[PDB]
Amino acid sequence: HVPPYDVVPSMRPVVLVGPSLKGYEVTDMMQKALFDFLKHRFDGRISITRVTADLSLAKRSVLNNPGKRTIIERSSARSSIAEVQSEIERIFELAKSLQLVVLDADTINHPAQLAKTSLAPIIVFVKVSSPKVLQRLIRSRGKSQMKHLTVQMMAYDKLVQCPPE
Amino acid sequence: LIIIGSFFMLNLVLGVLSGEFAKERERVENRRAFLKLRRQQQIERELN
């Protein structure tokens, strides 16, 4: 029984997904440069917020109030769902004051991970033309990224296989 | 003697060699080598 209407923030939070996987040097370098430009060129009308915790657990048709109080000692009461649920309406609050907002979520890496949620945000893609370029770009950092280079590549082509639309 | 001997034959030699080099470049083996050079330079431009 999907409602014909859904509640969404007034104006879209800006979520830009890294080419392979956030939290690493090569990916983090990609967004911070864009983070700098949006703050400088568009100063006084853009607010930047970082979502340190998870944001992929945005559910609306699970239960009336899972973990309403922290004294229930329930499995979900002491879990991280309570804080993630509280972070949803903060994005709503930033939207109502007419200033555009962005999301520095360090966990979501796919469009479908944050597509069915009530956020329905603007998705920005930064990608390299070929994986041949990406592997050498990773090499330009140093030996530290060589340990995680393997997991760095399967996380890249997965996003490419997602439809552009 | 000089014009027919030295200059005319020089004209023929350059022409014949130029034609041979043109055909040599378009052999399948040479085309793949050039194609590799093109792709490597594109990667370098993209990486830069």
Swiss-Prot record, chain A:
The lineage of its organism: Eukaryota, Metazoa, Chordata, Craniata, Vertebrata. Component of a calcium channel complex consisting of a pore-forming alpha subunit (CACNA1C) and the ancillary subunits CACNB3 and CACNA2D1. The channel complex contains alpha, beta, gamma and delta subunits in a 1:1:1:1 ratio. Interacts with CACNA2D4. Interacts with FASLG. Interacts with CBARP; prevents the interaction of CACNB3 with the alpha subunit CACNA1C thereby negatively regulating the activity of the corresponding calcium channel. This is Voltage-dependent L-type calcium channel subunit beta-3. The gene is CACNB3. It is found in: Cytoplasm. Residues 29-165 are annotated as: Mediates interaction with the alpha subunit. Expressed mostly in brain, colon and ovary. Belongs to the calcium channel beta subunit family. Regulatory subunit of the voltage-gated calcium channel that gives rise to L-type calcium currents. Increases CACNA1B peak calcium current and shifts the voltage dependencies of channel activation and inactivation. Increases CACNA1C peak calcium current and shifts the voltage dependencies of channel activation and inactivation.
Swiss-Prot record, chain B:
The chain crosses the membrane at residues 1-18. Brain specific; mainly found in cerebellum, cerebral cortex, thalamus and hypothalamus. Expressed in the small cell lung carcinoma cell line SCC-9. No expression in heart, kidney, liver or muscle. Purkinje cells contain predominantly P-type VSCC, the Q-type being a prominent calcium current in cerebellar granule cells. Disulfide bonds: none annotated. It is found in: Cell membrane. Voltage-sensitive calcium channels (VSCC) mediate the entry of calcium ions into excitable cells and are also involved in a variety of calcium-dependent processes, including muscle contraction, hormone or neurotransmitter release, gene expression, cell motility, cell division and cell death. The isoform alpha-1A gives rise to P and/or Q-type calcium currents. P/Q-type calcium channels belong to the 'high-voltage activated' (HVA) group and are specifically blocked by the spider omega-agatoxin-IVA (AC P54282). They are however insensitive to dihydropyridines (DHP). Each of the four internal repeats contains five hydrophobic transmembrane segments (S1, S2, S3, S5, S6) and one positively charged transmembrane segment (S4). S4 segments probably represent the voltage-sensor and are characterized by a series of positively charged amino acids at every third position. It is linked to Spinocerebellar ataxia 6: Spinocerebellar ataxia is a clinically and genetically heterogeneous group of cerebellar disorders. Patients show progressive incoordination of gait and often poor coordination of hands, speech and eye movements, due to degeneration of the cerebellum with variable involvement of the brainstem and spinal cord. SCA6 is an autosomal dominant cerebellar ataxia (ADCA), mainly caused by expansion of a CAG repeat in the coding region of CACNA1A. There seems to be a correlation between the repeat number and earlier onset of the disorder. Belongs to the calcium channel alpha-1 subunit (TC 1.A.1.11) family. CACNA1A subfamily. Voltage-dependent calcium channels are multisubunit complexes, consisting of alpha-1, alpha-2, beta and delta subunits in a 1:1:1:1 ratio. The channel activity is directed by the pore-forming and voltage-sensitive alpha-1 subunit. In many cases, this subunit is sufficient to generate voltage-sensitive calcium channel activity. The auxiliary subunits beta and alpha-2/delta linked by a disulfide bridge regulate the channel activity. Interacts (via C-terminal CDB motif) with CABP1 in the pre- and postsynaptic membranes. Interacts with the spider omega-agatoxin-IVA (AC P30288). This is Voltage-dependent P/Q-type calcium channel subunit alpha-1A.
